Design a protein around this ligand. Sequence first.
Ligand SMILES: Nc1ncnc2c1ncn2[C@@H]1O[C@H](COP(=O)(O)OP(=O)(O)OP(=O)(O)O)[C@@H](O)[C@H]1O
Ligand SMILES: [Mg+2]
Ligand SMILES: [Mn+2]
Ligand SMILES: [Xe]
Length: 527
Amino acid sequence: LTPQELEAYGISDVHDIVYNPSYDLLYQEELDPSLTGYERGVLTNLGAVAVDTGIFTGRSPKDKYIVRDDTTRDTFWWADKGKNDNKPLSPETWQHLKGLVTRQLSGKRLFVVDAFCGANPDTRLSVRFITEVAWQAHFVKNMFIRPSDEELAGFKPDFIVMNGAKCTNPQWKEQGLNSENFVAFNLTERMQLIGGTWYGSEMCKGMFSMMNYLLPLKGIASMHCSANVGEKGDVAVFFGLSGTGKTTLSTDPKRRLIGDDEHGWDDDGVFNFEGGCYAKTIKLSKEAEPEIYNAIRRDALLENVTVREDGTIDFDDGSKTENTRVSYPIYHIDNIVKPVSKAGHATKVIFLTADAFGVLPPVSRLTADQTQYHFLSGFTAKLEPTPTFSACFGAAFLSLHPTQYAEVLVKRMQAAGAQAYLVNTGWNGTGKRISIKDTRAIIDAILNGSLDNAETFTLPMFNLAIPTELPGVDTKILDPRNTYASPEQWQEKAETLAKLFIDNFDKYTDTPAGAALVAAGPKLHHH
Ligand SMILES: Nc1ncnc2c1ncn2[C@@H]1O[C@H](COP(=O)(O)OP(=O)(O)OP(=O)(O)O)[C@@H](O)[C@H]1O
Ligand SMILES: [Mg+2]
Ligand SMILES: [Mn+2]
Ligand SMILES: [Xe]
């Protein structure tokens, strides 16, 4: 608000302050014909501005650091103490990084965006974002919850995010850091600092990481999931790692969207942390994903897409990155929950995975113990298939130990009588990905209760119950062995994958409860 207020954060000599920039002002800022470099936007024929995020086209987990002090020492899940990105940082080194950012933002025109993280007043964070790049302010205006005029009048930040993308750290070698870039958090000062990377989602996932610290410590599940609700009031959540289908599949014309990536689950039900959605656009098909496509219009913000001279978008071009994205406020989707993005208790819990090994079934109904086993496992794979095991389908954002997320999620699911399903949105023996059309039909059958009491057969080794039939889907692909020339091709790959699961899960077996969950995992006692 005032330059004296900004000085309290360490930022000096600010000549122009743009508080709560409007969408109209951000549009004209991005398209200012005198901008240079990665600040510049271009207007597409869809009416949305597109930007280039620079050398970073994704988050940088290797540059993530958390100050280790008496607030975080005994509560945080530290990288140096299972695998995670919560690397410890000294208070002294933090002060050096803070000097870099605050000096970079001193003497600049700054955008200040006030917003909320969390749909519920009783648990939301009030966050103040400070940046010198208009499209970064636009990103957080889209992705966080935009306060009302009454809420702005009494706004009191709980957390400050200072984005110094244009600065770098010359001392990183002597400070033992990964690179000249940094994404750093201090829970004593309640601040996030960013240097070197311009990428906007460091701010979203920085605050998600903070919600992931606070909410489970007070009994509230904090979840990397999309969520929607049917006309009957039945709520579903969709967990999964990146590219597995949370945004694609939750944006469903038969359902009201609650949110697409970050939710809590408290005594009243499931609630969104965010005010927008962050869709993948590589090979985007208007026919397959019409709601996402039709959200790409003025006030959406396209990232890293190829824009031709005539202003048309080549959505198929990944030569800068396969991670092309668009952010938009959530009301760019027609059928959403409003005026607050929340609903009741989830009764369907769907774990999405993209299995590049071609082993897992398109749909399995999970036992209670299998639900815990596969939630802690957090599997997906990419094309030679390369596995990722990321606890809770989102280990990059966990600030507490994985079992603390599992414990509170189990409590919420048991109290609501929820049923869980494992859905392979990836590959089978055809070497092709299951179609969006078939996957949507599988989701329909989960959501309408088709599968809750359906007859099943059991997949060997993983011991997964698979429905014998499903409306709208070719029965043949329900059994993953059927898309190989022989069940023998499937067995070889299944044993490889089972061994990966078993090795990965070992770390959890030093508690009685974790040891007991081994029996719910894949079983392999030869080779
Ligand atoms: N059968 C399928 N189901 C879901 N998505 C599919 C399928 N086949 C291809 N896709 C594509 O896979 C990608 C799914 O990405 P999506 O944006 O839903 O990931 P996400 O789970 O939301 O990840 P993030 O957490 O990174 O946002 C999209 O590009 C989508 O078009
Ligand atoms: Mg998504
Ligand atoms: Mn995500
Ligand atoms: Xe779980």
